[PDB]
């Protein structure tokens, strides 16, 4: 399930950081990557902690292996959009809050109360009780 689209996407993300001795992401490379990233999240223990998720030396092959968690769901772009579409009869403005809350909580592979709170704190909604499915699909892959 690691797709050519996904690994090429990861390859450019590796290659932009790179430039260090023949194809290895290191501490400095990450530190100066943050300089063009607009945020001072460069703190030394946290930076060097991100190396512990691999056995050593982050080359491109190791970088794909590090992202092994990410693939464990990760159904492709329009499949998640198509899945949500089945639960919308009204055609954008999308899924009514009560129905969605029931769908996750008491139907199929049931959500825990903590999982429901974890989502309601980051779901897009109106003031009546409707939930934007397409905005949730966008949030899963992120572009803002």
């Amino acid at each position: 399930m690691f797709d050519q689209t996904q690994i090429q996407e990861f390859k450019e993300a590796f290659t932009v950081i790179d430039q260090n001795r023949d194809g290895i992401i290191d501490k400095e490379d990450l530190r100066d990557t943050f300089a063009a990233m607009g945020r001072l999240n460069v703190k030394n223990e946290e930076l060097d902690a991100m190396m512990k998720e691999a056995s050593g030396p982050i080359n491109f092959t190791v970088f794909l292996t590090m992202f092994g968690e990410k693939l464990k769901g990760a159904d492709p772009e329009d499949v998640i959009t198509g899945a949500f579409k089945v639960l919308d009869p009204e055609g954008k403005g999308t899924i009514k809050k009560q129905f969605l809350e029931e769908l996750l909580t008491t139907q199929c592979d049931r959500f825990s109360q903590e999982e429901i709170k974890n989502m309601w704190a980051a779901f897009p909604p109106d003031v009546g009780g409707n939930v934007d499915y397409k905005n949730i699909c966008y949030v899963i892959t992120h572009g803002d």
Partner: protein
């Protein structure tokens, strides 16, 4: 008593509705488990001898497969469920002009305002578009579509 074939068919329906892997169906769903077996139980039938809770209410009780087996046999399989002959003469109460035609508003009103009242959502889902100018709805066509 049920046949081995009936027991396995009832089980094939059951193994869809115990969807959380528990080997147990939530009590609310038992009416719709019966509907999935092709019986047509009234909510009055469902709350009495079938032992269902309130409408749309979850969590209150659950049912094992062996418990479900007399709850098919002694319930909708032990009674009249109505035939074509029932529906034709019940509809003929609302046939003003004798032509097999009833207004779509009047037919929706019978479903939503009378008996074990239907949601508008239920009524629209079952409507096969059979409305003319003011030639309205052929009610026999509706009965044959709903009983196929």
């Amino acid at each position: 008593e049920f046949s081995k074939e009936q027991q396995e068919d009832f089980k094939e329906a059951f193994l869809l509705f115990d969807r959380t892997g528990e080997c147990k169906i939530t009590l609310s769903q038992v009416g719709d488990v019966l509907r999935a077996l092709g019986t047509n139980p009234t909510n009055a039938e469902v709350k009495k001898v079938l032992g269902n809770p309130s409408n749309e209410e979850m969590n209150a009780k659950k049912i094992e497969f062996e418990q479900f087996l007399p709850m098919m046999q002694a319930i909708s399989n032990n009674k009249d469920q109505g035939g074509y002959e029932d529906f034709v003469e019940g509809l003929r109460v609302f046939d003003k002009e004798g032509n097999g035609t009833v207004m779509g508003a009047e037919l929706r009103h019978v479903l939503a305002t009378l008996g074990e009242k239907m949601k508008e959502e239920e009524v629209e889902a079952l409507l096969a578009g059979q409305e003319d100018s003011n030639g309205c709805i052929n009610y026999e066509a509706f009965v044959k579509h709903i009983m196929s």
